[PDB]
Symmetry: D3
Subunit: 301 residues, 6 copies
Amino acid sequence: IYNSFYVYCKGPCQRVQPGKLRVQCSTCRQATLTLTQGPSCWDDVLIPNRMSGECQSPHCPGTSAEFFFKCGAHPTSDKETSVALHLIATNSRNITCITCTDVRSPVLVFQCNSRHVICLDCFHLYCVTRLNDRQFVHDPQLGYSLPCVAGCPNSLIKELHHFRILGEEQYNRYQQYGAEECVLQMGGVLCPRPGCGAGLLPEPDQRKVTCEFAFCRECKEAYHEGECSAVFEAYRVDERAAEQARWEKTTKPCPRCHVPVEKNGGCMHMKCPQPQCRLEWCWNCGCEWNRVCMGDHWFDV
Amino acid sequence: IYNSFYVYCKGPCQRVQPGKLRVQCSTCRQATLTLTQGPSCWDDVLIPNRMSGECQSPHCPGTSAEFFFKCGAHPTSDKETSVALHLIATNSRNITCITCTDVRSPVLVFQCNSRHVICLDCFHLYCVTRLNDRQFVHDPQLGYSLPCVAGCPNSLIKELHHFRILGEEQYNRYQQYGAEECVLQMGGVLCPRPGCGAGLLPEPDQRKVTCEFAFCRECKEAYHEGECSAVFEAYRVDERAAEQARWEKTTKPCPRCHVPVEKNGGCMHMKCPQPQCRLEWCWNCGCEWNRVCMGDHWFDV
Amino acid sequence: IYNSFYVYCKGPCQRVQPGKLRVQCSTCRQATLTLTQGPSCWDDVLIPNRMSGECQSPHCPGTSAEFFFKCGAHPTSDKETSVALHLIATNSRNITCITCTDVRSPVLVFQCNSRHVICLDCFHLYCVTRLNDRQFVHDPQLGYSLPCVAGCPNSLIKELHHFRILGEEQYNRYQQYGAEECVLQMGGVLCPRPGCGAGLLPEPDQRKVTCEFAFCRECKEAYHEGECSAVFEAYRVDERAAEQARWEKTTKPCPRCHVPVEKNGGCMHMKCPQPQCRLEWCWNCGCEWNRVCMGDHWFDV
Amino acid sequence: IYNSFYVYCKGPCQRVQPGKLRVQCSTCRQATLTLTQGPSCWDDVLIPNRMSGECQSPHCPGTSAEFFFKCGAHPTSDKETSVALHLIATNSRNITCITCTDVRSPVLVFQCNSRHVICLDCFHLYCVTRLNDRQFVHDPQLGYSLPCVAGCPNSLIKELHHFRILGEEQYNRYQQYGAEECVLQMGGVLCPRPGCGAGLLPEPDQRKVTCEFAFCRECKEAYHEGECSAVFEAYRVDERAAEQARWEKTTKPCPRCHVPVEKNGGCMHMKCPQPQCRLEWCWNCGCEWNRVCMGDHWFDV
Amino acid sequence: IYNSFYVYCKGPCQRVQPGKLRVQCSTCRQATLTLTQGPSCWDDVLIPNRMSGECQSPHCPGTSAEFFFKCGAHPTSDKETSVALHLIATNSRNITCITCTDVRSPVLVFQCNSRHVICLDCFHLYCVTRLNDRQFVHDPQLGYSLPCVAGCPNSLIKELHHFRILGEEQYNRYQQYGAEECVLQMGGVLCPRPGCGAGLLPEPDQRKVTCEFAFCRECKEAYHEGECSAVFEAYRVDERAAEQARWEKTTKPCPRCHVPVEKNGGCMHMKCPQPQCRLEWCWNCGCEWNRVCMGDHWFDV
Amino acid sequence: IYNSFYVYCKGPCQRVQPGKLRVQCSTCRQATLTLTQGPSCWDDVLIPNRMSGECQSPHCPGTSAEFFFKCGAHPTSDKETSVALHLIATNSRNITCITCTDVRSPVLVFQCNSRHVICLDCFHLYCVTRLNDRQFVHDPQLGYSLPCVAGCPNSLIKELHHFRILGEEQYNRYQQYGAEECVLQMGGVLCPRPGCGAGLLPEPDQRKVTCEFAFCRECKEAYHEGECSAVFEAYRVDERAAEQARWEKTTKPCPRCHVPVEKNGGCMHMKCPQPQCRLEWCWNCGCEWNRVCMGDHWFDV
Ligand SMILES: [Zn+2]
Ligand SMILES: [Zn+2]
Ligand SMILES: [Zn+2]
Ligand SMILES: [Zn+2]
Ligand SMILES: [Zn+2]
Ligand SMILES: [Zn+2]
Ligand SMILES: [Zn+2]
Ligand SMILES: [Zn+2]
Ligand SMILES: [Zn+2]
Ligand SMILES: [Zn+2]
Ligand SMILES: [Zn+2]
Ligand SMILES: [Zn+2]
Ligand SMILES: [Zn+2]
Ligand SMILES: [Zn+2]
Ligand SMILES: [Zn+2]
Ligand SMILES: [Zn+2]
Ligand SMILES: [Zn+2]
Ligand SMILES: [Zn+2]
Ligand SMILES: [Zn+2]
Ligand SMILES: [Zn+2]
Ligand SMILES: [Zn+2]
Ligand SMILES: [Zn+2]
Ligand SMILES: [Zn+2]
Ligand SMILES: [Zn+2]
Ligand SMILES: [Zn+2]
Ligand SMILES: [Zn+2]
Ligand SMILES: [Zn+2]
Ligand SMILES: [Zn+2]
Ligand SMILES: [Zn+2]
Ligand SMILES: [Zn+2]
Ligand SMILES: [Zn+2]
Ligand SMILES: [Zn+2]
Ligand SMILES: [Zn+2]
Ligand SMILES: [Zn+2]
Ligand SMILES: [Zn+2]
Ligand SMILES: [Zn+2]
Ligand SMILES: [Zn+2]
Ligand SMILES: [Zn+2]
Ligand SMILES: [Zn+2]
Ligand SMILES: [Zn+2]
Ligand SMILES: [Zn+2]
Ligand SMILES: [Zn+2]
Ligand SMILES: [Zn+2]
Ligand SMILES: [Zn+2]
Ligand SMILES: [Zn+2]
Ligand SMILES: [Zn+2]
Ligand SMILES: [Zn+2]
Ligand SMILES: [Zn+2]
């Protein structure tokens, strides 16, 4: 199957999962909105009111589309939506990871000029080490983020929900980044347990600190007897692996009548212009258009 | 590569990972203990003092082996150990999952007579739904656990760290199972945030409850506007899939001289008896014995 | 793709092709009939009024389904229907042909007890040789037909459109079988050209006969200088190949929630009973139910 | 197996089939002609007396070769020959079809500069639609033909037996192309049934016309109730697919002694020059020369 | 390609090679003998005058066939024949070697009841160790030989040229087995160099012995400073591997007309009985009979 | 498995085999020498005292490494060493043989500018034919050798043990090349049997010559009745095959921490510079460094 969308499911999955793209009429909130034309890129499904259509509800004049995503690994309730992580894609071309050189799927593609790809396991370790070592980048408008692991300019991650890959515990810490940075510069420490967000002052010599629990100063986990995790000691990129890890009018004949059909951007919905055919079909699957292709890969970029 | 050991790495991975088996002399705590014979089953590496050897440390009389495991996905500090999840194995035979029928690896194998296998994704959902729906089984000696999804007798999970697969947040809740069961039977509710373990009494009609945060009574997550996760509504097993999902003097010739060599249980260390050969080798890999085979698959059962 | 239906397209294909199954309301002849339950076997789509549903047309009280098939290799007009050849199936199990031992697809499966399979190339040659050698079997109710090539009892082909595989020219001759058999028993000959269906009497010695054209008596094609086609000289079956060429409560877990779902006969439409899920899905494809699965493989037997 | 020759078998196959190339002495018509050198291209086997050899018949002085082809799918009588369709080749390089983009075999290769390839299914539909829509090209010397589907100059098909792919019925119509074009320009209609080649005049308003049967004016098949086949409504080529669908002293060492041997054009017969070896062998198969290689692929171009 | 015959090429190959089977008229020694029927087993090509045919030579009355084999890896002179090693076969079924458990080809199949197979590398080492350790079995009629490595009864190798696998040097020693056994029982030693077959008496204490060169007593190679080859120290068979290493009216339809044809023993030459077909073909290859199939696999057992 | 070393095993194998690279302290001859850094090319293991390390023997001051190779196909005694054939390599890139065009492994790579590769079967035949036809090249310093089969300049083989591929018998003859060339230029003949190296004078007309055995003058094997081996009659290279048969700061991330690690020449031993990791690993295998990688592929060039 072809998945062009990945979401962060906060529960029950608590991880990145293939998602289902859905539409509804923005005015009556019903699944009765038939699109004039399908979405062809992320902006079409992320920016309010980008796209128009016809509501088939009885007395609804609604004309605007409202998109949302759902985790596909299990049943979901009506409003159990998840956030789309648009940087994450199926690794069709089998691009190697910039860090581990393995071919993995799905992958995260940075918005740097080179479009470097990183597997999720490596992105996770990247975020965790930068968080622990206080190496996130402050952006006054966005907040705290990270660029491409290669340190390319103009690659700061903008959709901050990608940091959900940190994990529940670490993500909460990340949400407190600004506050903790303050506490630290005064020589203080922040209790890591979520409920108790209490500030604490210990002596700069001691590494063990206690609160209303027992935790380690440098590592911020439960106090330990010797040394913190080897990964948390204290960013160089293999020149070859980084080159290998780059992410790099189109028509196709109608599957039924073979007349050339023009593709609209990344949109997978094809409409045959031939008046005796008029086949509506999926660019990827070659079959007639249907709800599965819509949910799984309405567009791909 | 062949991994016979899986551990729960609490950080930085925060998930199940292939582990490395290590030995040290129990008396001097140094990696100088040469085993008289290798471990051949889980009891040999889990039960204190099961196995004997020779310490090569200067003045150490130590003769007993002490085993421990480490996450292999990243560097680890000297005492960064992880707990072995002995129910989890590589799915070599490509057994289907009892629940989803997919072939996955690694898998968890229950200790029921049928040895049913379940993929980790499904085991995770199983634990999460049973936790939320308060369907764990109390065992006075062990604590709270779950049997095989098929409900087979004598299949209660004994090594409770397998529930780490719940996730950090859910695992903490699970650790409070006995306490919360008390609070619930009095009609009370337990605050879900880890720091604030505060008991709370609301009216039995209301679903929204507030504490020193805003959460949902039935779901125990942040309060939501409509209905809880579809998976948390309120155990039948597909008869075919369950049958498909079952887990079912041995010698081999020396790779060098071809004399038959007897295998000792699940131990992968083979010792050729032929006096002009004496090859020490790996049952699985066919190469001479070395530290990689020891760490990755010293034994397999 | 999975095709469970094959039709004879009379034009433009003039051959056996994968077909599309369609439904309409029998009373208003519109594609507005939603089936109460899908077809599960050939009788459900071949026998009038077998199945019931709901017409969604404005003022239509229609409740009965009317099925028809269309060639799928090209656009078709509204009423360009083709006849289903229900003996013909995809060779999923890779059964060898009873005659040539090759694995081919699709294949024709005879209705003999052994369910012998024959590839279409071989079925074609079988029909052509039996036609030329006057070895069709008369059945007073049906007309003229052929049994299994192995000569098994109760294997007479009933849906005579399977003989369309003869080809346009030969099929016309076959349609004249009774008449020609009469002409032949009087020592006469029938002109083979379709327009001129003229009876002709020549001398029993001559093989060349002329009509209002020039054709051969024994072969019924254009007169030739020497001997008829080697295949038309004048039925033994390889015992091994014939054995090899035999065609030999089921549930499956919901792809979304994994509850076991019961299959209804050969019907591919699955309906999850789990009230928080209710997934409608394809037994074969594992995806949610849609128009493609309906057209291509609504049922398979 | 490697087939370099395809023929049209008029019966019993009534379709394109792999053919067998044969030679005989042109003077005694016996299979006793040993070629001085083998054919190396189509002209060598198509043009009378191109090639010389030695007849091994008793008192025959014959020195000239006469080539002919036979269908290989079944036994053939002595003079059951079939016409070679030299445009048709095995698709070894897996070139995509110019129309459907599928990789098929065998394929027809047009004689345009680009050497566009078209699968037989698509060539068939091309001929049928052009025939029905009266879009064949008149060439006073040849007769009626079609160029490359891309409309490339100097691509008119010259060997008209390639139109046999039309089918028996349609081919007869095609043979009447000039006559029917006359009848049509006077506003008349030609009866389609082969025997009755009768001209008919109906009123220009009516579409139904009757003859000494009932047929449709526009479609020329049996009269129908609504609309003609969707393919027969009334030539644009996908620029990408057309580029993809292009068809684009050589020595090889002796398989036995490894001395380099020069290939003669497309001829597969290799003769080792090494005096202690003298191996005669097949360029393609690497085995010694034999009757199978001769029949199946004496040459390939 | 399919090779049913293996020979020992004494030069230039000096090893086991696929061989070519040839026939000639026994009386005129010319390759003009056409077999009445082909060989169907080893006895047919090994035992004089087993098979009859027709000589096509001018005035030769010869009727008896004389078979011989030639190495196929290079050109051979007219009488450059090699000895057939009939125990050696292509390992089509991928039987494991009784000693090394590897799947190799070709293999030697012992004539024990179990038909144990051994790869050539292992057979070679078996012969070499038994030779050096003086463990060949004396058979007064045959000479010196070895049975199956498993020590099965009635498995003594009869065609002694299989010991050519020893190698040129070791084979010469083997040819002197009886003589050397005599020299050894008197406490003497035989010089190993082929030219100098001189008997020598040294003192039973010394291991170094000199002749008209310097060699080792126990090893019979050039004198060495320490210990003989580890393999030459001084027969147990892995029960599983030995079981794994066992070697375990037939008709087929004519490739052209599909009439069942009876196979004659191991003979690959098939003759269709159908009078309008009469195809002569190869059981294995499915193509018409030719010189390549004859040379490579005229029969297989 | 990856083998970078091939040796000539003189017994029991008597052929080219994958070898094991070993090290010892040059002063105490014990396997206690730990290399400061591993070998990175042939010169490091072939030239005395190239490399330094630390002896771990009690009172040994030894600091120099001494390398040697052993046949790996069977047990070897302590000093059973074999000669490394450094021209021979695993054919990883699947280069075709310059002579037979087949892809074989291992292959011999000549030291010509083009680095032509030749499979061992072909190299063997090359040496045998040149030996028999007296076409070896004299080099006053080296002795007698052969260049690249293509006759490229500066390609003379320097390590003469590569001629061991001749075989035991032929190799002895080759060792007598200078002497025999003398005997031949006087019109004399050398007896081929190893023990009897006797010079012999026959009449220049006769081909049969007898000694203290019966052998052929031209062929130097046992006298034969007709013509010598077809290969021994009396060097042209296929231009295409010869082009096809050419043999054509590097870092890699640490498998554990992913920091880029610099490779040292052909050495496979990698040492991670990251102070919290320090993984020692194999470039090829990606696993931690061990005795198997050392023996099989310590370096590769
Ligand atoms: Zn989810
Ligand atoms: Zn609306
Ligand atoms: Zn990665
Ligand atoms: Zn970047
Ligand atoms: Zn706290
Ligand atoms: Zn710490
Ligand atoms: Zn279309
Ligand atoms: Zn799709
Ligand atoms: Zn970890
Ligand atoms: Zn100790
Ligand atoms: Zn599962
Ligand atoms: Zn169970
Ligand atoms: Zn709280
Ligand atoms: Zn809730
Ligand atoms: Zn051994
Ligand atoms: Zn191993
Ligand atoms: Zn059609
Ligand atoms: Zn209706
Ligand atoms: Zn068939
Ligand atoms: Zn039957
Ligand atoms: Zn007529
Ligand atoms: Zn006829
Ligand atoms: Zn469900
Ligand atoms: Zn489906
Ligand atoms: Zn045919
Ligand atoms: Zn003639
Ligand atoms: Zn096509
Ligand atoms: Zn063109
Ligand atoms: Zn008519
Ligand atoms: Zn019409
Ligand atoms: Zn040759
Ligand atoms: Zn060939
Ligand atoms: Zn040979
Ligand atoms: Zn004769
Ligand atoms: Zn073996
Ligand atoms: Zn045996
Ligand atoms: Zn001697
Ligand atoms: Zn010795
Ligand atoms: Zn036949
Ligand atoms: Zn054959
Ligand atoms: Zn060896
Ligand atoms: Zn030393
Ligand atoms: Zn070669
Ligand atoms: Zn060269
Ligand atoms: Zn001599
Ligand atoms: Zn000779
Ligand atoms: Zn590292
Ligand atoms: Zn390695």
